[PDB]
């Protein structure tokens, strides 16, 4: 399984994801970005089955980019979460559902920063911190231990690295490299890759 | 030309001012939504047409205002609701639209029957519109307008366009749309508050 | 005389005295075509058609004016022949869908109503014209006996003892009334059906013609067949001598 | 569920219990199982609970459209044949088990309607899970052409024989008496089983539950 | 049991001239807490609430389809909805997708806006209405609060006495359920005010 | 262009519907119906225009159900088409509702079909009118009539065709002095009505009579010798 | 179920039991499995109690509309052919075994058996239902050729009573019907009026 | 048919000098029950083609009215063209193959006999559209119990007379009555010649 | 808008119908004359029920009314299947006038030659609307259609006073049909329907004869 994590602070929505994509026993790509940018200030971290991720997240990326073109202003992160939740929910009763586990993360000029969670059944939940994959089972309790709601963005990188070192020590899959990027009020920056 | 609804934009609210027209005496004075049709929690409208084709145009705007809210869980911005009907009318009545959204603040629009809209600071549609469009262009401080100063302008330009000797205090339907404590309030003003603006005009204009 | 108003451009339009002209104009193509007759006897139904030949190049058997619509029913048409071949193909499909649903040969009182309500159905709409063909239908069975119905382009379907359709339908009917056919047998009327054709044929105007004959009756076990080359030649000799 | 019906020479007496179960635990103690169709035709209901409700309501609207258009009181054979031609079309995929009964101009008629669309016109039927317990009373104590109060005592004894013997039945007995003249919809007819009066006193005092936060929103009058 | 995929524990209880609806706060995948602030009680009027348990993605779908159908109702009719009618509006929303259902079992609780009579209801997953005078429950821990509410419900309760009765029934039922809990939220709907209290619970 | 389709006149008239009533008078025939206290009779002219007609195939009386009778007056091809809907709609009532259709609801079914011809411009009205007779279960005998317009009123006695107006004045006059009828001597009222206005009364094999009674509800067309009994006594 | 139809010279004789079960419980014990399709044509229903009612009510509609158009009493072969085309088109979704017996003026008394699968064959006597298997030897032995109307009634009533005694799915009372030119004569045998063979 | 209800059994067939004789027993089995004992499983298609079928007798009664109406439809238009025995066989191959492709087969197995234009035709059609022509055919357990008796005579004597192939069929019917549980005492042989199709009466084995 | 103006000519040629909204009720009175004594007076009905609480009468063409009385009964039961409440009278007229508008809109179909008067009762408050062939609909206190409706609406305006009860509205409705009757109205020549808290019902002809004694 592939790994997602998000840490919301007072003004930043720090997210990370692995850079590995795997077939059966080999792994095929060593630098695979699983993060899709939708606006200047929101992302969408999508994992799940083969194929359904790049078909759903590209569908949500261009329909939210279509909202910016028709209107000039971009969607809020809350409305982009409910737009993502709306499409994933009403297709799971159709003949072609999607098996994508999402982690949406954006900043808003009025409402502030926001991290969103949904499973493959499209149950949207706003969380201060969330994670996906089998590696979520290890790393949520480092986050349940050391997360204050007012954590600085430099103490959130070191909180992120404690979670990723737990995957190096305890998790059975080789997840050596991670893409890390921050979503403060100035947009989507890109922190240096945490690798081991 | 049937209605006489007019919009006025202010710094802290927009207001529609429609007149209740009753042709025959045996028409029932309806106690329902008469002239100012509320579209969702932060936007209202008014039509220049008969109250049967009003119920087609407003209950189509309310489908668009709730297919948006079902899809994004946010209230619709007060230009996309104007635009989506103007796309439907592009494929036969003129409207006004008052509302508030977080993008461009207090808004006022005017949909042509051809399918064209425009943002107005104050305008009129319906009976004797150009008689009162010209009267608004005389006296409207385009930016220095308070709500009550806009509200006194409404019953000023309605006393020179409708009726005889009382400004039809029980037949004029001012609704104001304000911001208060985060939510959005739409106040169809009551008959006691609508009568006193006639009283505060007939005293101030005679003196 | 003429009318310039459009009360005769559609069959979905009544005239201001209550006539549908496009139906009444459709039975002018029937009233101008050559004569087809049919006489019912005590033991069957005989048809006979004055078949005009229009070119010596046409083979004997072209423009078959006697159809078989089921293995017990015949059909003798008048009028616009291209429309008659379409009402032959409807009468065959109606007779075929009856056996596919009810499992026996279709009665002739009921076949000539399914077809007559197909002809009527085109006399109602502005998109289709009425048929330019009256026609007859004759059958024989142990149950129903001998029956002969005619269908007009209006869609009315009556049952006849003797019938005539075509431009000499008036002169043919007064010859059929000379017959007292309720006592005569089926072979004796093939002599008479062929006799009436040679009488009503105006050899001055119409150049030349073949004679088509077909019975249906108890002498061929109730199936509709073309009269053979021997019995048609004798009836063409008894007529041309008369 | 225990629903029943009988014919009493002047009409139809319909009976039903009130226990609605969700699994093997009692959901509603005062359920209503006798449904309206027309002012002279009611219909008890067993089987799937929603497939009984939304079907008899559909028949009660399709037969009001028949009633207003004909301008006369509907017939029970119409309500039979609307039901059996609908349940057959869904091939038993809607579990409607019905004790349709009513009084029309032809007289008293009572039908049992099975979910696959088979119907059966009897002088006495029972359906439901307690149906076998209630035919014990009708095969023993039914005689043709009874009186009104004699038939009500028969149907109430039949539903009570389903209350005290079926686990998915109980808590009250609903009756419905239809005649040519009247209609007695007797909703608390017999209460065989009541809740016992409690001996202890377990009332939550004020201030027991601690609260984290409390937001109070006053509403306009 | 797909309705135990996310847990859920929603309960309504009728009092005198007031109702009370209560639910838990947990959002969980099969046995894994995700959030502790998941909304299961939705405002459907001035004093009329619905509560949804079951599969948590239909907690959010049915609450938005209904708010879609409620806002069209409240503007076309020109009045607030009667609580007996919202019951049938949910009962047509759930039965329309019968063959393949919304995996939720909603309970509604509100006041009749012209009479202020208390009304509570419960619905099956395919839309079977159920009007009780005492209480209705729904959720993974259904039998646990069936037993707490024929022990504590007395008729004709005061609003401060109703609040203790529904909260002491929610707390002791979700503590005997593994997948329901993480805090309880309680709404007391009265004639003149709505008091929303979330209360101290065991966080598993 | 408001005379070639069924749209309104500036005075508010449908001209094709009015022209369709003139199509009923083109048949040259006339039908008379009358209701008794326990019976219902219909009487037509049976014109045999050709000597080669099988007269058993020329009729205007039709069984619609086992106990609902009909008589069609007007365009003969339109008449057989409107029987076929009454044949269908009366047997479709029995399959959907489990009881015999009333004469109330069969005229209202046929007239609602006929209204659609008077509103869609893509089809003409049928130029023929239907008179349905039958015994109700609770109201006794019924004699109703549809028209090309779509009116389905109920009658004590009615008429149709070329002598419609003249036969009405004969039926109005007898329905004012007495109760218009009694039992199956009501047949004598209708045969005099068609013989007074047409002024022939030549033979007893030139009419066609059908009856429904309370004691026998089924529609039975009277034979020639059965109808000679009422005419020898007339 | 045990149904039976026997042809004589002048008409037919019908017969059925009156028991409809749901497995091993008797839901109805006074059922009427002889349904009138037309005035002189019946069917005997056997098999699925919902399929046979929904087929027979459709053929009563299809034959009733066919008969008023033709203005003749319809053929019994025509009635069974409607059952054939109904049972054959939907035999992937029916369990309806029908035997059709009646009278028509063209060929007298006729018995047609349409079993499951919807073939149609004219038999001199037809037997059907789950209890028909118990009396094949009885009805093949004592069937004379040319029995009277009263003799076919006792031959039907003995043969049904023998199968009701052996089949659990059969039982109840015997419903007999005789269809001839004169009309339909229906009698119901209950109690000691039913034959007992010891 | 997705499940056959009233089945037939082995239909023979053998071509001789100037015609084809096929035979079948007069019996429909409702699953090891001799239920209908007077049914004909051999069809006269037209004057030069005959047809017998095993398998479901209800599906065969459907083919008697589809192929039966199709023969009448060619006789109405009177053009002189009838269907050849190869035409019915090639039509019926397309009918049976189209029904397996809808996964709704006709549960039959036909033997198309025929004599036209101075050739005997004998064609097999299965329920899968499997079609061929052979000097001898036998469906069902006749493919095991009688097709060895037909192929042995047709190797030593490749051309039979009419009486040689008639007694050969009746030798094969008697083996089928002895050794096929679904078989029956009464059968019928039908024969096409230059004269036409002649179905014989209820012949009995002895 | 040409056929719509001409359909109103078919309404204004139709028989008079009068509707008056009282304090606690609505009355719908109309003209049901017969051309001859041969017509059964009680066979067809002009005042006609929709729900238990809604009835409607017409002026104009007879058969076009039955299309609208068959759709208004469907639209009242399509409401009742969904919401399980009797349909508001305001909401019924919005759906009926949408049907009447739907035939003006589509081509090749003439409009209805029918105006409707639609009574009703909801929430303890009476309702009386009028739907035109254009699809327009108006709420009325009292109005009239048919022959001499201009004289009818002026007659109603002099004799209307909103404090009148339902029994006082049946008199002023028959007095409005009295002015343009041209004959002698019996219990059969008119049809009255009243709508109150108990629901809609058309009056039996023996009940009308008590009101004709005034």
Curated annotation (Swiss-Prot), chain A:
Belongs to the peptidase T1B family. The lineage of its organism: Eukaryota, Metazoa, Chordata, Craniata, Vertebrata. It is found in: Cytoplasm; Nucleus. This is Proteasome subunit beta type-2. Induction: Up-regulated in ovarian cancer cell lines. It comes from the Eukaryota. Keywords: Acetylation, Cytoplasm, Host-virus interaction, Nucleus, Proteasome. The modification N-acetylmethionine is found at residue 1. GO terms for biological process: proteasome-mediated ubiquitin-dependent protein catabolic process. Non-catalytic component of the 20S core proteasome complex involved in the proteolytic degradation of most intracellular proteins. This complex plays numerous essential roles within the cell by associating with different regulatory particles. Associated with two 19S regulatory particles, forms the 26S proteasome and thus participates in the ATP-dependent degradation of ubiquitinated proteins. The keyword RNA-binding does not apply. Pfam families: Proteasome. One of its GO terms (cellular component) is nucleus. The 26S proteasome consists of a 20S proteasome core and two 19S regulatory subunits. The 20S proteasome core is a barrel-shaped complex made of 28 subunits that are arranged in four stacked rings. The two outer rings are each formed by seven alpha subunits, and the two inner rings are formed by seven beta subunits. The proteolytic activity is exerted by three beta-subunits PSMB5, PSMB6 and PSMB7. (Microbial infection) Interacts with HIV-1 protein Tat.
From Swiss-Prot, chain C:
Induction: Down-regulated by antioxidants BO-653 and probucol. Up-regulated by bacterial lipopolysaccharides (LPS) and TNF. PROSITE patterns: PROTEASOME_ALPHA_1, PROTEASOME_ALPHA_2. Its main location: cytoplasm. It holds the Pfam family Proteasome. SMART domains: Proteasome_A_N. GO terms for molecular function: ubiquitin protein ligase binding. GO terms for biological process: proteasome-mediated ubiquitin-dependent protein catabolic process. The keyword Nucleus applies. The modification Phosphoserine is found at residue 242. The modification N-acetylserine is found at residue 1. One of its GO terms (cellular component) is nucleus. SUPFAM superfamilies: N-terminal nucleophile aminohydrolases (Ntn hydrolases) (SSF56235). This is Proteasome subunit alpha type-3. It comes from Homo sapiens (Human).
UniProtKB/Swiss-Prot annotation, chain F:
The modification Phosphoserine is found at residues 9, 55-56. CDD domains: proteasome_alpha_type_6. The modification N6-acetyllysine is found at residues 94, 96. The modification Phosphotyrosine is found at residue 151. The keyword Cytoplasm applies. GO terms for molecular function: endopeptidase activity; NF-kappaB binding; purine ribonucleoside triphosphate binding; RNA binding. Keywords: Acetylation, Cytoplasm, Glycoprotein, Nucleus, Phosphoprotein, Proteasome. SUPFAM superfamilies: N-terminal nucleophile aminohydrolases (Ntn hydrolases). The keyword Nucleus applies. Its main location: cytoplasm. Component of the 20S core proteasome complex involved in the proteolytic degradation of most intracellular proteins. This complex plays numerous essential roles within the cell by associating with different regulatory particles. Associated with two 19S regulatory particles, forms the 26S proteasome and thus participates in the ATP-dependent degradation of ubiquitinated proteins. Belongs to the peptidase T1A family. NCBIfam families: PRK03996.1 (NF003075). The 26S proteasome consists of a 20S proteasome core and two 19S regulatory subunits. The 20S proteasome core is a barrel-shaped complex made of 28 subunits that are arranged in four stacked rings. The two outer rings are each formed by seven alpha subunits, and the two inner rings are formed by seven beta subunits. The proteolytic activity is exerted by three beta-subunits PSMB5, PSMB6 and PSMB7. Interacts with ALKBH4. This is Proteasome subunit alpha type-6. The lineage of its organism: Eukaryota, Metazoa, Chordata, Craniata, Vertebrata.
Swiss-Prot record, chain I:
The gene is PSMA2. GO terms for biological process: proteasome-mediated ubiquitin-dependent protein catabolic process; response to virus. Pfam families: Proteasome, Proteasome_A_N. This is Proteasome subunit alpha type-2. PROSITE patterns: PROTEASOME_ALPHA_1, PROTEASOME_ALPHA_2. The 26S proteasome consists of a 20S proteasome core and two 19S regulatory subunits. The 20S proteasome core is a barrel-shaped complex made of 28 subunits that are arranged in four stacked rings. The two outer rings are each formed by seven alpha subunits, and the two inner rings are formed by seven beta subunits. The proteolytic activity is exerted by three beta-subunits PSMB5, PSMB6 and PSMB7. GO terms for cellular component: cytoplasm; cytosol; extracellular exosome; extracellular region; ficolin-1-rich granule lumen; nucleoplasm; nucleus; P-body. Changing residue 92 to V: In a colorectal cancer sample; somatic mutation. Keywords: Acetylation, Cytoplasm, Nucleus, Phosphoprotein, Proteasome. It comes from Homo sapiens. Phosphorylated on tyrosine residues; which may be important for nuclear import. It comes from the Eukaryota. Belongs to the peptidase T1A family. Induction: Down-regulated by antioxidants BO-653 and probucol. Down-regulated in response to enterovirus 71 (EV71) infection (at protein level). The modification Phosphotyrosine is found at residues 6, 58, 103. The keyword Oxidoreductase does not apply.
């Amino acid at each position: 399984m592939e790994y997602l994590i998000g840490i919301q602070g007072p003004d930043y929505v720090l997210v990370a994801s692995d850079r590995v994509a795997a077939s059966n026993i080999v792994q095929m790509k060593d630098d695979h970005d699983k993060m899709f940018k939708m606006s200047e200030k929101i992302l969408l971290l999508c994992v799940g089955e083969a194929g359904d991720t790049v078909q759903f997240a590209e569908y949500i990326q261009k329909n939210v980019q279509l909202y910016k073109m028709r209107n000039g202003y971009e969607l809020s992160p809350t409305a982009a979460a409910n737009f993502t939740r709306r499409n994933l929910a009403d297709c799971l009763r159709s003949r072609t559902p999607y098996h994508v586990n999402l982690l949406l993360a954006g900043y808003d000029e009025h409402e502030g920063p926001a991290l969103y969670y949904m499973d493959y059944l499209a149950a949207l939940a706003k969380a201060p911190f969330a994670a996906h994959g089998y590696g979520a089972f290890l790393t949520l309790s480092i986050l349940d231990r050391y997360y204050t709601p007012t954590i600085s963005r430099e103490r959130a990188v070191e909180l992120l690295r404690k979670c990723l070192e737990e995957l190096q020590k305890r998790f059975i899959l080789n997840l050596p490299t991670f893409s890390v990027r921050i979503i403060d009020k100035n947009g989507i920056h890109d922190l240096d890759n945490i690798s081991f | 030309h049937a209605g006489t609804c007019l919009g006025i934009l202010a710094n802290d609210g927009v207001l529609l001012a429609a007149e209740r027209r009753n042709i025959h005496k045996l028409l029932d004075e309806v106690f329902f939504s008469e002239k100012i049709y509320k579209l969702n929690e932060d936007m209202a409208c008014s039509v220049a047409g008969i109250t049967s084709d009003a119920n087609v145009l407003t209950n189509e705007l309310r489908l668009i205002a709730q297919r948006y809210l079902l899809q994004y869980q946010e209230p619709i911005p007060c230009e996309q609701l104007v635009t989506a009907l103007c796309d439907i009318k592009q494929a036969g009545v003129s409207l006004l639209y008052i509302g508030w959204d977080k993008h461009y603040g207090f808004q006022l629009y005017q949909s042509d029957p051809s399918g064209n809209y425009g943002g107005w600071k104050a305008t009129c549609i319906g009976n004797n519109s150009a008689a009162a469009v010209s009267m608004l262009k005389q006296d409207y401080k385009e930016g220095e307008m308070t709500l009550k100063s806009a509200l006194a302008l409404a019953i000023k330009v309605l006393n020179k366009t409708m009726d005889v000797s009382k400004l039809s205090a029980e037949k004029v339907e001012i609704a104001t749309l304000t911001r208060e404590n985060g939510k959005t309030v739409i106040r169809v003003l009551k008959q006691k508050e609508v009568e006193q603006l006639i009283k505060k005009h007939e005293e101030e204009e005679a003196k | 005389s003429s009318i310039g108003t459009g009360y005769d451009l559609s069959a979905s339009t009544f005239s201001p005295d209550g006539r549908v002209f496009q139906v009444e104009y459709a039975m002018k193509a029937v009233e101008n075509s050559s004569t087809a007759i049919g006489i019912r006897c005590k033991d069957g139904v005989v048809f006979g058609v004055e078949k005009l030949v229009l070119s010596k190049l046409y083979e004997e058997g072209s423009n078959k004016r006697l159809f078989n619509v089921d293995r017990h029913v015949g059909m003798a048409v008048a009028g616009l022949l291209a429309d008659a071949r379409s009402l032959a193909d409807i009468a065959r499909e109606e007779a075929s869908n009856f056996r596919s649903n009810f499992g026996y040969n279709i009665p002739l009182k009921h076949l000539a109503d399914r077809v007559a309500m197909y002809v009527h159905a085109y006399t109602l709409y502005s998109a289709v014209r009425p048929f330019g063909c009256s026609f007859m239908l004759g059958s024989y069975s142990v149950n129903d006996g001998a029956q002969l119905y005619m269908i007009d382009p209006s869609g009315v379907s009556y049952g006849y003892w003797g019938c005539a359709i075509g431009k000499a339908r008036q002169a043919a009917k007064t010859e059929i009334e000379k017959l007292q056919m309720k006592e005569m047998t089926c072979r004796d009327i093939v002599k008479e059906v062929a006799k009436i054709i040679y009488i009503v044929h105006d050899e001055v105007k119409d150049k030349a013609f073949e004679l088509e004959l077909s019975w249906v009756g108890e002498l061929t076990n109730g199936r509709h067949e073309i009269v053979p080359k021997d019995i048609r030649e004798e009836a063409e000799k008894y007529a041309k001598e008369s | 569920t225990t629903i029943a019906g009988v014919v009493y020479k002047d009409g139809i007496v319909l009976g039903a219990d009130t226990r609605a179960t969700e699994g093997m635990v009692v959901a509603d103690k005062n359920c209503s199982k006798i449904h309206f169709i027309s002012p002279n035709i009611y219909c008890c209901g067993a089987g799937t609970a929603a497939d009984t409700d939304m079907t008899t309501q559909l028949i009660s609207s399709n037969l009001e459209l028949h009633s207003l258009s004909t301008g006369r009181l509907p017939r029970v054979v119409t309500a039979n044949r609307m039901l059996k031609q609908m349940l057959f079309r869904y091939q038993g995929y809607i579990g409607a088990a019905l004790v349709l009964g009513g009084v029309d101009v032809t007289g008293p008629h009572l039908y049992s309607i099975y979910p696959h669309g088979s119907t059966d016109k009897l002088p006495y039927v029972t359906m439901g899970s307690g149906s076998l317990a209630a035919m014990a009373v009708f095969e023993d104590k039914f005689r043709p052409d009874m009186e009104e109060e004699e038939a009500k005592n028969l149907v109430s004894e039949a539903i009570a024989a389903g209350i005290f013997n079926d686990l998915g039945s109980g808590s009250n007995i609903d009756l419905c008496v239809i005649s040519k003249n009247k209609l007695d919809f007797l909703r608390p007819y017999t209460v065989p089983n009541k809740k016992g009066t409690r001996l202890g006193r377990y009332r939550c005092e004020k201030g027991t539950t601690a609260v984290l936060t409390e937001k109070i929103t006053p509403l306009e009058i | 049991s797909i309705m135990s995929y996310n847990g859920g524990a929603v309960m309504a209880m009728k009092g005198k001239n007031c109702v009370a609806i209560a639910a838990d706060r947990r959002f969980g995948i099969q046995a894994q807490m995700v959030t502790t602030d998941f909304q299961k009680i939705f405002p459907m009027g001035d004093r009329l609430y619905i509560g949804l348990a079951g599969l948590a993605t239909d907690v959010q779908t049915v609450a938005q389809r209904l708010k879609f159908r409620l806002n069209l109702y409240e503007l076309k009719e020109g009045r607030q909805i009667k609580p007996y009618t919202l019951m049938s509006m949910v009962a047509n929303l759930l039965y329309e997708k019968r063959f393949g259902p919304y995996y939720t079992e909603p309970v509604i609780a509100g006041l009749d806006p012209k009479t202020f009579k208390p009304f509570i209801c419960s619905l099956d997953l395919i839309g079977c209405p159920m009007v009780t005078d005492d209480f209705v429950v729904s959720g993974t821990c259904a039998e646990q609060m069936y037993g707490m509410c024929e022990s504590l419900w007395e008729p004709n309760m005061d609003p401060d006495h109703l609040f203790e009765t529904i909260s002491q029934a929610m707390l002791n039922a979700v503590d005997r359920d593994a997948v329901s809990g993480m805090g309880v939220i309680v709404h007391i709907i009265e004639k003149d005010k709505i008091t929303t209290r979330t209360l101290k619970a065991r966080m598993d | 262009f408001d005379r070639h389709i069924t749209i309104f006149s500036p005075e508010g008239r449908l001209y094709q519907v009015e022209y369709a009533f003139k199509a009923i008078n083109q048949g040259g025939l006339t039908s008379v119906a009358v209701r008794g206290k326990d019976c219902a009779v219909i009487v037509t002219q049976k014109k045999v225009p050709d000597k080669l007609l099988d007269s058993s195939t020329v009729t205007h009386l039709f069984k619609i159900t086992e106990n609902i009778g009909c008589v069609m007056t007007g365009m003969t091809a339109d008449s057989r088409s409107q029987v076929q809907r009454a044949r269908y709609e009366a047997a479709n009532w029995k399959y959907k509702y489990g009881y015999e259709i009333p004469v109330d609801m069969l005229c209202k079914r046929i007239a609602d079909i006929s209204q659609v011809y008077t509103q869609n411009a893509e089809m003409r009205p049928l130029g023929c009118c239907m008179i349905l007779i039958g015994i109700d279960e609770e109201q006794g005998p019924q004699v109703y009539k549809c028209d090309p317009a779509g009116y389905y009123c109920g009658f004590k006695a009615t008429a149709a065709g070329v002598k419609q107006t003249e036969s009405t004045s004969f039926l109005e006059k007898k329905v004012k002095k007495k109760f218009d009828w009694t039992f199956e001597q009501t047949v004598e009222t209708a045969i005099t009505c068609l013989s007074t206005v047409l002024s022939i009364d030549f033979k007893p094999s030139e009419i066609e009579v059908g009856v429904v009674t309370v004691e026998n509800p089924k529609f039975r067309i009277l034979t020639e010798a059965e109808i000679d009994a009422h005419l020898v006594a007339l | 179920t045990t149904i039976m139809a026997v042809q004589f010279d002048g008409g037919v004789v019908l017969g059925a039991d009156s028991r409809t079960t749901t497995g091993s419980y008797i839901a109805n014990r006074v059922t009427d499995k002889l349904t009138p399709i037309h005035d002189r044509i019946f069917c005997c229903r056997s098999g699925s109690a919902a399929d046979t009612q929904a087929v027979a009510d459709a053929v009563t509609y299809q034959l009733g509309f066919h008969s008023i158009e033709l203005n003749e009493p319809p053929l019994v072969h025509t009635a069974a052919s409607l059952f054939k085309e109904m049972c054959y088109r939907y035999r992937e979704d029916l369990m309806a075994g029908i035997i059709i017996a009646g009278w028509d003026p063209q060929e007298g008394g006729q018995v047609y058996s349409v079993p499951m699968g919807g073939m149609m064959v004219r038999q001199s006597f037809a037997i059907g239902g789950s209890g028909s298997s118990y009396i094949y030897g009885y009805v093949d032995a004592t069937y004379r050729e040319g029995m009277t109307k009263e003799e076919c009634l006792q031959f039907t009533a003995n043969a049904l009573a023998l199968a009701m005694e052996r089949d659990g799915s059969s039982g109840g009372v015997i419903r007999l019907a005789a269809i001839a030119e004169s009309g339909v004569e229906r009698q119901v045998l209950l109690g000691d009026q039913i034959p007992k063979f010891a | 048919t997705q499940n056959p209800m009233v089945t037939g059994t082995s239909v023979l067939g053998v071509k001789f000098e100037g015609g084809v004789v096929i035979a079948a027993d007069m019996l429909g089995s409702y699953g090891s029950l001799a239920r209908f004992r007077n049914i004909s499983r051999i069809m006269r298609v037209n004057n030069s083609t005959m047809l017998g079928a095993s398998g479901d007798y209800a599906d065969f009664q459907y083919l008697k009215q589809v192929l039966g109406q199709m023969v009448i439809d060619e006789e109405l238009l009177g053009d002189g063209h009838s269907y050849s025995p190869r035409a019915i066989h090639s039509w019926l191959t397309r009918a049976m193959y189209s029904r397996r492709s809808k996964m709704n087969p006709l549960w039959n197995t036909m033997v198309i006999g025929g004599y036209a234009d101075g050739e005997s035709f004998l064609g097999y059609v299965d329920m899968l559209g499997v079609a061929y022509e052979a000097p001898s055919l036998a469906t069902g357990y006749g493919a095991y119990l009688a097709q060895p008796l037909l192929r042995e005579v047709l190797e030593k004597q490749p051309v039979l007379s009419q009486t040689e192939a008639r007694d050969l069929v009746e030798r094969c019917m008697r083996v089928l009555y002895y050794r096929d549980a679904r078989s029956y005492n009464r059968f019928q042989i039908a024969t096409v010649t230059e004269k036409g199709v002649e179905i014989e009466g209820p012949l009995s084995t002895e | 808008l040409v056929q719509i103006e001409y359909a109103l000519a078919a309404v204004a040629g139709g028989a008079p119908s009068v509707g008056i909204k009282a304090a606690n009720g609505v009355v719908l009175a109309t003209e049901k004359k017969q051309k001859s004594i041969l017509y059964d007076e009680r066979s067809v009905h002009k005042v006609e029920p929709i729900t238990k609480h809604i009835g409607l009468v017409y002026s104009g063409m007879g058969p076009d009314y039955r299309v609208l009385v068959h759709r208004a009964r469907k639209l009242a039961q399509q409401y009742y299947l969904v919401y399980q409440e009797p349909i508001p009278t305001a909401q019924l007229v919005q759906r009926v006038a949408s049907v009447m508008q739907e035939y003006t809109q589509s081509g090749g179909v003439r409009p209805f030659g029918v105006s409707l008067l639609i009574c009703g009762w909801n929430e303890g408050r009476p309702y009386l609307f009028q739907s035109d062939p254009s699809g327009a609909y108006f709420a009325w206190k009292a109005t009239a259609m048919g022959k001499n409706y201009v004289n009818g609406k002026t007659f109603l305006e002099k004799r209307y006073n909103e404090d009148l009860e339902l029994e006082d509205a049946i008199h002023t409705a028959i007095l409005t049909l009295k002015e343009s009757f041209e004959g002698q109205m019996t219990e059969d020549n008119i049809e009255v329907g009243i709508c109150n808290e108990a629901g809609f019902r058309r009056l039996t002809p023996t009940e009308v004869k008590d009101y004709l004694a005034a």
